[PDB]
C-alpha cells in the first residue's frame, strides 16, 4: 500500500502523436496544442517499434 501511494504521487505524462521518426533515437511529435518536437526515447522502446 505504501508503494502504491508513492507512485501515484507523481506528475502525469503527456500524450502526443508521432508523425515519423528521425535517426538515432529521435522522433517528430506534435502533442496536441503546441508546435512539433524532436525528443529522445527511453530504454525499453525502440525505433523499429515506432
Amino acid at each position: 500500500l505504501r508503494e502504491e501511494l508513492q507512485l501515484l504521487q507523481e506528475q502525469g505524462s503527456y500524450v502526443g502523436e508521432v508523425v515519423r521518426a528521425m535517426d538515432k533515437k529521435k522522433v517528430l511529435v506534435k502533442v496536441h496544442p503546441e508546435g512539433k518536437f524532436v525528443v529522445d526515447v527511453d530504454k525499453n522502446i525502440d525505433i523499429n517499434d515506432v
Binding site: 500500500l1 507523481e10 506528475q11 502525469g12 505524462s13 502533442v31
Partner: protein, 70 residues
C-alpha cells in the same frame, strides 16, 4: 501503520479539485483523461473506484499537481 496508510489515501479526495473528462482506458489502473483546460494528459488512477462507471466517458475529478483520477 495500515490505518495511517488508509488515512493518507482517503484524504486525497477532499481537495478543491479540478474537473476533467474520461477519454480512454489503457490497461489495469492507467488511463487517458482530457481536462477542461485542454492539453490531453496521461495519468495513473487510484485503487478505490469501481471501474464500471467509465465506459466511454465520465465527468471526473482530477488532482491539481499529479493530475490523477480521484
Amino acid at each position: 501503520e495500515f490505518l495511517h496508510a488508509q488515512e493518507e489515501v482517503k484524504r486525497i479526495q477532499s481537495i478543491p479539485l479540478v474537473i476533467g473528462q474520461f477519454l480512454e482506458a489503457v490497461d489495469q489502473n492507467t488511463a487517458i483523461v482530457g481536462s477542461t483546460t485542454g492539453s490531453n494528459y496521461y495519468v495513473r488512477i487510484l485503487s478505490t473506484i469501481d471501474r464500471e462507471l467509465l465506459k466511454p466517458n465520465a465527468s471526473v475529478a482530477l488532482h491539481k499537481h499529479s493530475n490523477a483520477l480521484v
